[PDB]
Design a protein around this ligand. Structure first.
Ligand SMILES: *[C@@H]1O[C@H](CO)[C@@H](O[C@H]2O[C@H](CO)[C@@H](O)[C@H](O)[C@H]2NC(C)=O)[C@H](O)[C@H]1NC(C)=O
Ligand SMILES: *[C@H]1O[C@H](CO)[C@@H](O[C@H]2O[C@H](CO)[C@@H](O)[C@H](O)[C@H]2NC(C)=O)[C@H](O)[C@H]1NC(C)=O
Lengths: 272, 148, 145
């Protein structure tokens, strides 16, 4: 494994101070780090180096140097105006998964004056199971969909209170895919100068999606019907007709779409 | 401006159905449980009542609707907890130092508490169907009237 | 009292569980009349002294909405209780309310008290239907205050 300078486990500095992270190792190595553009790089022969002439709280974080072809140090920049260094403002994960809220504390001393909250000074839901990690922020293990929210990291030390901006967390019970589509009936000729119905529905885990029915390239105007059933939302566009013409005939399309994509299904209607 | 047209469909009859089944399954009981809610004697405006009730309802769902894991009611309550989270995009925060304004402690029966939760979702649903921007209302004056 | 052997079973024991599994866990605690183990050690006479009380519980306290699974669950749970008089032999009942005490507990508990009754019952009756035919006067005389 490589060698780091200055080194050991945890390095703490006052802001403004200059700091260089040298990775002493054979030939080329590499810095896995929570940083840019607040550090300066220089990967040479004796290894790589990270430098800053002004150590700012934004420099707080964990840096790892690995044998390009295995050594880590964590830097805290003790600044009182800022008790937190936010590595990201939004985190996405899957049900059951671990969720890190990159609220990195900037002063090991604060270790015991930390708390995870929701906005407005509201506590986090009782069903949310989490713990604090000095190097990584507050963490949620086995994240549930209900843990999805916007959280804030606080530190109240004798009247003094320091709170990070919001971290938007989103948990999905499954990876998001375009909504599922059903065209019922799959085909039909119910030629009569009259009666016929065509139902186009779509399914999704969240409400944010639309569904339209089309004849050829023309979108029809059908009212929307919506509901929630097992653990999903359903939306229908039901075409009802009482006496069909020859312009009613053609290829129908049920189209649905959300943030992820569009899903389409085709059916053929004939009337002679 | 955060509410979308999707609010008009966030609460579905299935949520209600499922909640009805929860209710319809509790034993009538000579109880009395404590919980925070709004007293209409202090806040009577329909829209503002609901806007104030929103978090109180969130809280109730979280700390009072306890069922055994994997129970059909447990699921339902979780499905509602989810809904209450999603609904946040539909209520614009208001202003007030007296955060606890218009909020009283109630002592009622578990079935009554559940009725309040039921009325909330029902009224919220009906109004959002009328217009999703509802709840985007400035309820400052209404809360300021609340006393004691 | 032979049909008594195979009276209670699982066709209703499970039904009483779905009942319990469906209740909201709150701070709620109700009052009810039930046997005080503090003055009744005999298991044979616990179930005996409890039968009446239980039947009351089932009839007064266990109230659910009409035509609801839990309702029906109680319905049957009652018929059983009634079709169960055919196995408990009355005892010398002077000082009627002896061995009984008022209880203030969560429905959670109570439901349980009813749970083990039809349990220890469906248990002992499987061993021998003539059980519950024992004389408990010596037992009840022990209940003080
Ligand atoms: C860093 O130094 C090590 C040890 O000196 C180099 O590893 C080699 O060690 C021996 C001397 O060259 C060789 O016999 C080995 O083949 C080799 N070790 C292995 C198996 O990797 C290492 O190459 C140096 N780093 C580099 C790549 O310059
Ligand atoms: C690193 O940050 C500090 C604080 O932001 C810098 O302090 C300076 O702030 C301004 C930005 O450069 C300058 O106008 C000032 O010269 C200085 N503050 C004062 C008035 O003393 C500091 O200069 C930064 N480091 C470097 C190398 O510029």
């Amino acid at each position: 494994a490589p060698v780091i300078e200055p080194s050991g486990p945890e390095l703490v500095v006052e802001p403004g101070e200059t700091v260089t992270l040298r990775c002493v190792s054979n030939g080329s190595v590499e810095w896995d780090g929570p940083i840019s553009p607040y550090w300066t790089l220089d990967p040479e022969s004796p290894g790589s180096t990270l430098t800053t002439r002004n150590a700012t709280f934004k420099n707080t974080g964990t840096y790892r140097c690995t044998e390009l072809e295995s050594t880590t140090i964590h830097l805290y920049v003790k600044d009182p105006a800022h008790s937190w260094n936010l590595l990201a403002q939004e985190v996405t994960v899957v049900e059951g998964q671990e969720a890190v809220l990159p609220c990195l504390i900037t002063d090991p001393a604060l270790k015991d004056s930390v708390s995870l909250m929701r906005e407005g000074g509201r506590q986090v839901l009782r069903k949310t199971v989490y713990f604090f990690s000095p190097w990584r922020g507050f963490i949620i293990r086995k994240a549930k969909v209900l843990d999805s929210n916007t959280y804030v990291c606080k530190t109240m030390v004798n009247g003094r209170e320091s709170t990070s901006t919001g971290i938007w967390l989103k948990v999905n019970r499954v990876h998001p895919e375009p909504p599922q589509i059903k065209l019922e009936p799959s085909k039909l000729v119910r030629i009569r100068g009259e009666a016929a119905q065509i139902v186009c529905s779509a399914t999704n885990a969240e409400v944010g999606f639309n569904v339209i029915l089309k004849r050829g390239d023309t979108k029809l105007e059908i009212p929307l019907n919506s509901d929630f059933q097992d653990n999903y939302y359903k939306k229908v566009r039901a075409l009802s007709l009482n006496a069909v013409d020859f312009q009613d005939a053609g290829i129908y399309s049920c189209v649905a779409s959300n943030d992820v994509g569009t899903r389409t299904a085709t059916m053929n209607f004939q009337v002679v | 401006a955060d509410p979308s047209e999707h609010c008009s469909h966030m609460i579905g009859n299935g949520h209600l159905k499922v909640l009805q089944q929860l209710i319809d399954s509790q034993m009538e009981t000579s109880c009395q449980i404590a919980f925070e809610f709004v007293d209409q004697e202090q806040l009577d405006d329909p829209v503002c009542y609901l806007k104030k009730a929103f978090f109180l309802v969130q809280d109730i769902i979280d700390e009072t609707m306890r069922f055994k894991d994997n129970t059909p009611n447990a699921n339902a309550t979780e499905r509602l907890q989810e809904l209450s989270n999603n609904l946040n995009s539909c209520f614009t925060k208001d202003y007030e130092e007296q955060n606890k304004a218009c909020v009283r402690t109630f002592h009622e029966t578990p079935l009554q508490l559940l009725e309040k939760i039921k009325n909330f979702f029902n009224e919220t649903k009906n109004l959002l169907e009328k217009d999703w921007n509802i709840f985007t209302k400035n309820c400052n004056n209404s809360f300021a009237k609340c006393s004691s």
